[PDB]
């Protein structure tokens, strides 16, 4: 799997706050955290599935 969802979440700058998911290695899958909606990374999916497809490699 890739190792952009190992990482953590990152909400970024800005102060959005939305609930979108990201991969937590320790999870084995992917959870929700706080997403600032700008300078995004790879760890920050709009939903389980779209996260899955990316990182559901476990």
Do not use: H, W
Request: glycine share 8%; proline share 7%; hydrophobic share 30%.
């Amino acid at each position: 799997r890739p190792d952009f969802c190992l990482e953590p979440p990152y909400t970024g700058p800005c102060k959005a706050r939305i609930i979108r998911y990201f991969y937590n290695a320790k999870a084995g899958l992917c959870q929700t955290f706080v997403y600032g909606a700008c300078r995004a990374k790879r760890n920050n999916f709009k939903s389980a599935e779209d996260c899955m497809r990316t990182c559901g490699g476990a």
